[PDB]
């Protein structure tokens, strides 16, 4: 589908790497590479859908 000049598309994938684990990337091409990592945790954190004015 044509999106802003392009008739192509990128598939997005995610990976978690534990301490002591290693991220290993073998690619022969078509790789949209990572520039680094997000620090991922878990807690009093969420998300909500709303159009309510924040005041």
């Amino acid at each position: 589908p044509w999106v802003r000049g392009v008739s192509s598309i990128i598939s997005i994938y995610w990976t978690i790497v534990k301490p002591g684990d290693i991220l290993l990337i073998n690619s022969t091409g078509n790789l949209i590479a990572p520039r680094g990592y997000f620090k991922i945790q878990s807690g009093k954190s969420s998300i909500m859908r709303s159009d309510a004015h924040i005041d």
Partner: protein
């Protein structure tokens, strides 16, 4: 009424008694009067405040739960997410509905308890010196001025010093 006092043998509540919940209203040679009974008033209030405090307490913060509105059709995994939440809500609504019902019935009934508790306390206080008229009032068979009435309320009424007079007034013919 369960204890049968409020809307049972007492005809009406006193709209003009705004200094308490339960109380006394009287007539004697020195006129008429009215004053609240702070013991039974406070007792009902304490019980209700207690359960009120106990109902109205907070819960745990809840943080990142599941999605409950869906913009697209996903079938089986969405079906379940919807089913879980719906189940939950029905159960919580039920609990709430039932809670209020039980609590309210109990509040109705405990306040009726306090009414009869006060009445019986007085009936015992007065021994053989007065008779139950049926409507929540007593017929006192001796002269009982405002000071006398103020010994009945306040529980400082020695029946024995009136006993003699009362018995003579109770046991005549007509």
């Amino acid at each position: 009424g369960i204890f049968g006092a409020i809307a049972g043998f007492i005809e009406n509540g006193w709209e003009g008694m705004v200094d308490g919940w339960y109380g006394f209203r009287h007539q004697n040679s020195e006129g008429t009067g009215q004053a609240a009974d702070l013991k039974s008033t406070q007792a009902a209030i304490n019980q209700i405040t207690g359960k009120l405090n106990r109902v109205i307490k907070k819960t745990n913060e809840k943080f990142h739960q599941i999605e409950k509105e869906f913009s697209e059709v996903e079938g089986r995994i969405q079906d379940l997410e919807k089913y879980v939440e719906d189940t939950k809500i029905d159960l919580w609504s039920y609990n709430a509905e039932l809670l209020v019902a039980l609590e309210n019935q109990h509040t109705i009934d405990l306040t009726d308890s306090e009414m009869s508790k006060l009445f019986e306390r007085t009936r015992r206080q007065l021994r053989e010196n007065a008779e139950d008229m049926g409507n929540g009032c007593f017929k006192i068979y001796h002269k009982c001025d405002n000071a006398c009435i103020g010994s009945i309320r306040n529980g400082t009424y020695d029946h024995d010093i009136y006993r003699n007079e009362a018995l003579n007034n109770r046991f005549q013919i007509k």
